Amino acid sequence: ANYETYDGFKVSEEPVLPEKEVHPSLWFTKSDIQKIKEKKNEDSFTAELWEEISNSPYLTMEIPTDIPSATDSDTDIHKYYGNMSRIAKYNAFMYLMTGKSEYRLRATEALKRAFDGPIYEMDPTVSGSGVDEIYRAVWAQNFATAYDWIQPYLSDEDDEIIRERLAKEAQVVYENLYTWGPRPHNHLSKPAWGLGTLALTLSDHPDASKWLNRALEAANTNTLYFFNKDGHYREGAHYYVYSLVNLIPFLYHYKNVSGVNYFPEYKNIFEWAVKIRNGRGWMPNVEDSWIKPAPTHMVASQYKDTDTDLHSTAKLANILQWSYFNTDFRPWEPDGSYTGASYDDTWDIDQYLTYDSTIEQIKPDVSGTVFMNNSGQTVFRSDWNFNNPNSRYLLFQGVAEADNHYHYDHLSFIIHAENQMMASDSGYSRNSYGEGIRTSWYLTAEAHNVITANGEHPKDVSENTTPVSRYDMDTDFFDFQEKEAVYDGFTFPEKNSYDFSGKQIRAIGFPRQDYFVVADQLFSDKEVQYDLYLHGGRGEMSGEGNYRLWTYEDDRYGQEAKMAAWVFPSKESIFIDKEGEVNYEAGAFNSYGYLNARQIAKDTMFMQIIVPLSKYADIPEVVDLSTDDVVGGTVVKDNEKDTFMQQLNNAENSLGDITTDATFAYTNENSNNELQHFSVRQGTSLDYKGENIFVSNKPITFALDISDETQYKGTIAALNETVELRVKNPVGVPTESVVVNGENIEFSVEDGYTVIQVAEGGDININFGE
Numbered sequence: 001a002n003y004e005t006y007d008g009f010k011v012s013e014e015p016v017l018p019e020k021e022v023h024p025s026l027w028f029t030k031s032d033i034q035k036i037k038e039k040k041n042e043d044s045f046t047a048e049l050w051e052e053i054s055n056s057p058y059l060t061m062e063i064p065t066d067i068p069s070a071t072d073s074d075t076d077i078h079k080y081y082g083n084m085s086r087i088a089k090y091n092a093f094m095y096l097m098t099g100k101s102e103y104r105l106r107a108t109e110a111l112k113r114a115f116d117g118p119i120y121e122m123d124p125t126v127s128g129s130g131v132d133e134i135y136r137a138v139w140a141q142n143f144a145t146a147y148d149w150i151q152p153y154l155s156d157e158d159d160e161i162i163r164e165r166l167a168k169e170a171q172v173v174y175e176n177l178y179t180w181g182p183r184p185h186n187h188l189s190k191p192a193w194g195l196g197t198l199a200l201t202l203s204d205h206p207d208a209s210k211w212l213n214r215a216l217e218a219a220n221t222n223t224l225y226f227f228n229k230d231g232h233y234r235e236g237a238h239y240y241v242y243s244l245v246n247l248i249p250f251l252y253h254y255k256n257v258s259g260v261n262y263f264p265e266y267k268n269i270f271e272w273a274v275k276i277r278n279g280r281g282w283m284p285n286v287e288d289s290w291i292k293p294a295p296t297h298m299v300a301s302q303y304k305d306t307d308t309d310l311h312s313t314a315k316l317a318n319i320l321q322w323s324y325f326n327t328d329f330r331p332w333e334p335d336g337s338y339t340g341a342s343y344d345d346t347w348d349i350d351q352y353l354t355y356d357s358t359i360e361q362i363k364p365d366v367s368g369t370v371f372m373n374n375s376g377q378t379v380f381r382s383d384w385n386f387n388n389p390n391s392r393y394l395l396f397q398g399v400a401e402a403d404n405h406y407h408y409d410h411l412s413f414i415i416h417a418e419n420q421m422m423a424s425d426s427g428y429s430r431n432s433y434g435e436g437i438r439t440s441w442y443l444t445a446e447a448h449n450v451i452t453a454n455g456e457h458p459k460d461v462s463e464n465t466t467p468v469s470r471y472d473m474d475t476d477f478f479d480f481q482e483k484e485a486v487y488d489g490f491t492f493p494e495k496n497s498y499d500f501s502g503k504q505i506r507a508i509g510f511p512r513q514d515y516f517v518v519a520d521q522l523f524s525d526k527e528v529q530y531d532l533y534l535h536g537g538r539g540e541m542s543g544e545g546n547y548r549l550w551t552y553e554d555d556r557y558g559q560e561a562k563m564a565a566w567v568f569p570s571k572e573s574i575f576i577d578k579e580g581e582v583n584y585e586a587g588a589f590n591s592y593g594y595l596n597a598r599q600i601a602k603d604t605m606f607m608q609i610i611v612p613l614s615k616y617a618d619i620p621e622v623v624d625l626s627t628d629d630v631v632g633g634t635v636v637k638d639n640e641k642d643t644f645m646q647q648l649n650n651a652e653n654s655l656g657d658i659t660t661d662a663t664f665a666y667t668n669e670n671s672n673n674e675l676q677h678f679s680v681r682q683g684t685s686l687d688y689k690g691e692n693i694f695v696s697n698k699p700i701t702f703a704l705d706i707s708d709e710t711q712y713k714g715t716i717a718a719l720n721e722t723v724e725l726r727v728k729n730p731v732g733v734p735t736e737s738v739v740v741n742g743e744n745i746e747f748s749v750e751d752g753y754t755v756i757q758v759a760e761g762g763d764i765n766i767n768f769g770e
């Protein structure tokens, strides 16, 4: 794997240390303490956090007199260091909050025993080590924070003892970081952030500069390769949150101790979580991941002066605050832990210290749909409403593969709608990384909503290069994007030679922002077998021929609902019912029906119509009108007829009421059988019932609402060159102006068409008179 050629980010590696240690300083100074003691009374959230912290069993439990041996279970050794680190931090905190003598004595005894026992006899390169770098990252931050909080009350003797213990763990992490983490995944970044905290705690130690520098260098190798600049984390949502356990404390520590503020440079990793949230605030079960909440409330306070494309006026802080509190937390009841570190972490304390009760929750007010083309995730989203069954969400996954925690999911999608998880990613595993079923099923192409060619998954053209996106369009009535992947490209494990050369171009559309069309073009230099898989998540599958229905019940993930799907072309494909595991969280795996549609072909097409429905909704009437060169059909839903057409080439062809040379076309009628909305990919003409709607002198991609005879409105996808576009006016109606991107463009009217030269895409209004 090339760790240097992904478009990630990095920060300065210059170690910045204050002139003299101050304790406390990691989270707050001496002067802050009484405000932090009083913080419990601000709102119901601070009150709940205070009730949890002040009743922690770590305040009352016997400090264990039994030190484990190197030959005890990895579980017991892990829990020993976890428990001792938690005794230190909880007791140190409650001493600052209350002044109770017992809390200082307990914090002091735990710190004097920090990293006693067999830890330095053990080998963290042994898989499942009880002292793995991922756990001691949390232990280091827990013990360092306890020391920061108790240091002013220690005897000179106890200070020297406890410093020597913290300094030894810092030296051992510094010396072994790159041996323990020879690949720059979360096993490198987490203990790097731990080392950072230790260096900032012991800023007067002679080696603190060396420690902090290596910490920053090591963390940068992770943020350069596993993160995109746009904030996407390539190990998935679960290992993102796992990383945040050490990253979020380190960011505050470095700002608070040295004045180095990295919150601006890390901003995108938090905005990313809000961009990909489903209607209940869950990050997707993509790569080795479960559904996750994103703890954006713990950094909201740092973004009060940061602009976001998620709101016309509000700052990022208010959107980060909105996102966390508009999450369904029931999948983490009754315990409440979503960090992945529930033996080690002090999440209640860290929340109590980071949460800002003065930040108003403001729902994003922009278009739901977002294109993150640098990483390659797109979300089609009707609205930002929380737990509303009228919402529709589709994630379109097209991320360059990383060499850790990877699933074969190129050009796959998941749907969240009617308050239920529908079209599915199969998830991480049954329980864990090491299960055989993860390799034989969960990571495999067939476990995803993809098309394989002779069983080969769609993949990257080259290592660390995002699959190309095109024809991005966002309107009130129709959204669109296509993504391109190859069959004979780059993957993990590495495969250099193929018996053929081929590619998939997948277009997704969002008709009426109400349902989905998935339109595939497939090109190969040879006859191959194309297998299309459609997984309906945790639903009962019914249906025959090209039609499948998945029926959901009230479960841990959503409400009773159903998802109806049709596949074209009916007459050129066979439909195979299969069964596969779908899992959203550790331990909750079950088997459900999925569809395998199959063609043997060289160049061909598929189309899916996928409709979220409430429990008792009518099934739409869907008719396949596919022929030799043309794939598509009609959908009659809620008394309106939509038409979808795809072809491989720019040739004049017809399907239902559409005639076009476009490689994709969408039309929507009203109740009254009048054309209301249309879109084309690379058309020079469209007729509807034999009436010309538009012509152009060169291929153009756009979407237009013609429902308002005083103003046609839509968007034109990005343009390579100048196109002369001619749109038919309502009969007998003049044009008054044409606006593209807030600017008048020159127009003429010829034979009842508005004629414009367009040199750039964007939003278009054609304003008519009477």
Ligand SMILES: C[As](C)(=O)[O-]
Pocket: 572, 573, 599, 600, 601, 602, 603, 604
């Ligand atoms: C699957 As075919 C190219 O025979 O329509």
Ligand SMILES: [Ca+2]
Pocket: 287, 399, 401, 406, 407, 408, 409, 410
């Ligand atoms: Ca993947």
Ligand SMILES: [Ca+2]
Pocket: 367, 368, 369, 474, 475, 476, 477, 478, 479, 513
């Ligand atoms: Ca839209």
Ligand SMILES: [Mg+2]
Pocket: 124, 125, 133, 179, 180, 181, 182, 187
């Ligand atoms: Mg390791």
Ligand SMILES: [Mn+2]
Pocket: 285, 286, 287, 288, 407, 409, 425, 426, 427, 428, 442, 443, 447, 448
């Ligand atoms: Mn997967």
